[PDB]
């Protein structure tokens, strides 16, 4: 007429009632708050820098419950802090090669980046450094100075730089290096940042093992480099962004190179195209999206977009369920309110990761409320 | 003896009436044995050497006690003691003569209970033993109380080794039962010919069960029983069998939500961290009760009041 | 219906719901008859003309309504209408195979409850059917819960004229009761040999008494039982015999103890006169029920509340 | 599990409780706010006279629970309305005559006396006036005026005066109607007014059929008067009152007069000697006195006692168990108090009956409390 207790118990706890429905009600809300008061978390630092550097601390060589790896790395990807250009596909590389995203200032590397290098590969004196420990500079001279590389190699390490001309031929450099064995690719525009972000954490999902990547074809071009052609050989496309980012004759240019018909996932701004990008049934199953990241959509500038370029891995990666990242600075749009709502079960989200600082609370008090938070 | 089993968890400031309980235990017999465990370890066998003589019963009550005062009164962070009771509560008898009066009264404050009302020309209930002039039913004089059907009181020849025991005498009942003005002569009323003994037996009398009619035959009754001493346990715990017993050192927080002021089940969960299985598991017997009518060991009417326990993990961080 | 007797008093506001159990007793077979009065006389007889045929039972259900609407709905100031209900609850059916499947589930929903729990050296519970390779009992792999024992569902013959009838299966268990390490074989479990069918029967399944254990026998267990279907009456009068139902032209005063404002007894008094026996009555099978544990049809657990009725003369003067 | 309700009800009042104690509690106390509300009457008019009639409409030729007769009845007592001195005790005759005890004005009779008196006795002209309907007049002509006597004789009653030169010879008139045939009488000081009005209900009280005569004696006297020994003969007396009101040397008068021992009852006051009269045994059973009168003491003035006067008679005869009077004007003695205490059963009393106006709120406050009303 009570059960035995743990031996540990600070107390026992009698709960008592004279109508069992008034007893029902607050066993049901013990269970509610007591399950409650565990998931929402912010990583951010004082710098994109600094934010890069705690994403790569909790998910990546790291004890954490929603981490990618636990063990050390042996690849890097390094973005230049300034140019989201260059490091835009980085997202599925750093996924397929289990590696962080990081993120440097183009002249020095950073002696706080340094460390999280070191820290994150186990780079050590005692040990040898085989041709297997490498670090992919996702971008040109413009993004991530020779000196920042040369310090890198100085340390004793293999350095890739995945980069070419442009942003396109930079894109492939890093799309080449992902798979490619699933018959399928994403393609985005050249200006489509925002567009490359929303579907960064897609790409970054591991299908049968494979990231699917991302390649940045010339939007005002007849048509896409041969490059492009021989990359995507025959496999199925998916192009992110509208007519203003990837015009209509790029997608016949795909569709004649591959024989097979791409399709488009796309709104009218960045914010409603990252809610299609959730409402994308190959992406995300409806009533199964339960972990969520949000990030700063770029609206009040440009390349404060690389928190999401960082996030993308980790929520492509996140549990047994990819989280989406939600693009939003000071407010969420209709649309990514919407497609929450119908992602989430009934029961509501499971994980939330604000990712930087800026993000205003208007954003996080309304995620939090879509997922029953 | 293992965490999350059926039985009862005593904090260290009610040591002293949960062992006063077991030696009650010991001495009236419901109790044949108590395996006394320190921690985790087996310490000692309490158990009358013949539970036939009174010494030997309290020789067994006061071991216990001894046994584990120290360790209950001083009872550290961390540290426990459990109880084994092997009972039965059918070889209770009732040792003291102070105890068995207590019960005897109990049993005297039914005496007034209606068993069976008066019958009607509608209603089924008591008649006379002989029909009228004409060869119908007459309505008895008085309803069938439990008065007219036992008499209450210790047994004779009873003392402190063989025990007093209550005991039922059945009375005499001349009255029948049918409707009034009906042809068909009235049934006998059967009296409890078992369960004529009860020594507060390792038990509390179910007087929802004790004393109580039995009619046999739907729209035409064919046969009438009462029953004799029918009991429900001390402890939710079935007749015959073992209950576990722990003593831990944590404090009794009472939450009673009918209460003024009381622990709200969100600063409950700020204050500590509870085991969801244990919430989840209380939950489920909550709503079966509610929406069925479903009793479980879970969930339990005590003192009018419906009541769960819960074990928290500890205190949370902040 | 008299005044003071047994059966229920409903009010003018709420004479349309009351009807309604009324005509849901009449389709479910609980009640075989209803003799309406208006006042204090009788008007008119309600019964099935065969208990068979669902439509005999819906006609006589209609016929009540019929007969009684106008005299309920116009209901003036010193009338009202009673009701005799020759009723014989083990008659009661399921006449929706929707509420039959709905009974279903509330027995479905007792599966998981633990009847015995699995036996260790300190405590007896379930054993297995052979002892190990030395002659000592060994731990059962389940504990005994009802879903063990029997199966639920609704009988094959059902239909609306017969009745959809919930029907328990008794089970088989080849798993036995006693202590682990003990060399005597363990007990058989006597299982379910009677109340193997519930038609809903004008009752309620009691789960303190439907499915449980009885042990017998103690230090040295000599016998278990666990019972069929055991039901209580939805109302306390008997599981057959005739019960009276009046509606009267009074408004309904609930006074709720439990609630922030109720009719303090003070003001209850200063607001009406009530009988002094009536109360008194009703005082006593309280303090019976409270000192003794001794239930009475003047007191009664209804929906996790006691209650008491009271019927007052009239208002008081000033 | 309900009970079939009176079609005249209000309403269905439906008491329900989550916890039985609760219940039992509002229960409790609804069985004692509706028993309660109903026992504490005032009897009282505008003046003494009024009092004493609505004393007689009330107790006499009356269907009252308390009342002495239910008939007309065939005696009257009648008092002077000043003078108590004269109806002092009148009260054991009301009594065992069956008669209220009414007070009239010395010189005229009151017309309101008047109509009680046809009233009382029912007086008629199409009816015989047979020579059993009867006047006492206790009282000489300075109590009760011979104007007044004629005034009842030309109605056409017989009228017979008890009466004498002094309260004394008054007392014996008044008790020689009485008669004396349980060998018990009782006595009281000429100054005993207040100790009259104390035994007065008890002298009321019928025991095997009569009343139990009450005597004034010169309570500073060497000696009773030749007609009280004559009248007590060899009876048993009770002395009411203390030496300053009945000397020593009287109580050894009445002795040898009468060849036996009389008893006292008597305190250092009025109050007490009130309070000694209830916890003398003879009169009242300790934890069986349930039935209470109240009425003015005569501190503030010696002639308001003439309420306790017509009341006394209806106190000795209230139901099967005898009431007292409690004398109390302002307030109620630390006597009386314990008295009622130890007179009262556990349970409390049954009914209180204040008589006159000029009663304290205090007094009948205090009354109830020791009553538990």
């Given at each position: 007429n009570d059960t035995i207790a743990s031996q540990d118990t600070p107390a026992k706890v009698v709960i008592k009632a004279n109508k069992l429905k008034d007893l029902k009600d607050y066993v049901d809300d013990l269970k509610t708050y007591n399950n409650t008061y565990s998931n929402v978390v912010t990583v951010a630092g004082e710098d994109r820098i600094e934010t890069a550097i705690e994403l790569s601390s909790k998910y990546y060589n790291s004890d954490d419950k929603n981490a990618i790896t636990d063990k050390a790395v042996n690849d890097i990807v390094l973005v230049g802090s300034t140019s989201i250009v260059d490091g835009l596909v980085a997202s599925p590389l750093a996924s397929e090669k289990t590696a962080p995203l990081l993120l440097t200032s183009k002249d020095k590397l950073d002696s706080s980046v340094k460390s999280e290098i070191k820290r994150v590969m186990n780079l050590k004196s005692d040990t040898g450094i085989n041709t297997s420990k490498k670090v992919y500079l996702a971008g040109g001279v413009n993004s991530i100075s020779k000196d920042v590389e040369n310090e890198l190699k100085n340390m004793g390490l293999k350095v890739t730089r995945l980069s070419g001309e442009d942003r396109y031929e930079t894109s492939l450099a890093i799309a080449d290096e992902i798979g490619l064995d699933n018959d399928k690719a994403f393609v985005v525009g050249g200006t489509g940042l925002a567009d490359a972000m929303s579907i960064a954490p897609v790409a970054s999902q591991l299908k049968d093992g494979d990231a699917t990547p991302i390649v940045v074809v010339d939007g005002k071009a007849k048509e896409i480099s041969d490059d492009a052609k021989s990359f995507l050989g025959t496999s199925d496309v998916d192009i992110i962004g509208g007519k203003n980012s990837v015009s209509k004759e790029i997608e016949e240019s795909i569709d004649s190179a591959t024989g097979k018909t791409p399709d488009r996932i796309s709104g009218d701004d960045r914010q409603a195209t990252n809610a299609e990008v959730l409402k994308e049934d190959d992406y995300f199953t409806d009533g199964e999206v339960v972990n969520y990241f949000v990030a700063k959509d770029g609206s009040t500038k440009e390349d404060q977009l690389v928190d999401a370029l960082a996030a993308a891995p980790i929520a492509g990666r996140f549990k047994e369920s990819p989280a989406p990242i939600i693009l939003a600075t000071d407010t969420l749009s209709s649309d990514q309110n919407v497609a929450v709502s119908k992602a989430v079960p009934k029961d509501g989200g499971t994980n939330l990761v604000q990712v930087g600082k800026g993000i205003a609370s208007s954003v996080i008090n309304k995620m939090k409320d879509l997922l029953d938070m | 003896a293992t965490t999350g089993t059926q039985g009862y968890t005593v904090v260290k400031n009610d040591w002293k009436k949960a062992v006063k309980q077991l030696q009650d235990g010991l001495k009236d017999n419901s109790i044949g044995k108590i395996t006394v465990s320190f921690n985790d370890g087996v310490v000692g066998e309490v158990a009358p050497?013949?539970?036939?003589?009174k010494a030997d019963r309290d020789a067994a009550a006061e071991k216990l006690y001894n046994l584990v005062n120290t360790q209950l009164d001083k009872l550290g962070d961390g540290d426990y003691v459990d109880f084994s009771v092997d009972y039965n509560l059918e070889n209770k008898i009732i040792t003291n003569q102070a105890d068995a009066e207590a019960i005897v009264t109990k049993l005297n404050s039914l005496n007034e209970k209606t068993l069976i009302d008066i019958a009607t020309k509608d209603t089924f209930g008591m008649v006379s033993k002989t029909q009228d002039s004409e060869g119908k039913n007459v309505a008895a004089t008085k309803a069938l109380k439990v008065k007219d059907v036992a008499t209450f009181g210790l047994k004779s020849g009873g003392s402190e080794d063989t025990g007093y025991v209550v005991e039922m005498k059945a009375g005499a009942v001349e009255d029948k039962y049918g409707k009034v003005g009906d042809s068909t002569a009235g049934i006998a009323i059967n009296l409890p010919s078992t369960g004529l003994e009860y020594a507060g037996k390792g038990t509390t009398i179910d007087f929802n069960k004790t004393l109580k009619v039995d009619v046999t035959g739907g729209s035409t009754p064919s046969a009438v029983a009462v029953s004799g001493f029918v009991t429900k346990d001390d402890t939710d715990l079935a007749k015959s069998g073992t209950i576990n017993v722990r003593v831990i050192n944590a404090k009794e927080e009472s939450i009673?939500?009918?209460?003024?002021?009381?622990?709200?089940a969100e600063n409950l969960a700020k204050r500590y961290v509870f085991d969801p299985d244990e919430i989840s598991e209380a939950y489920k017997a909550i709503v079966a009760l509610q929406n069925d009518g479903i009793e479980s060991n879970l969930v339990q009417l005590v003192n009018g009041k419906y009541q769960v326990i819960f074990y928290p993990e500890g205190k949370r961080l902040e």
């Open positions: - | 050497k013949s539970a036939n003589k009673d939500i009918d209460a003024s002021s009381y622990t709200s």
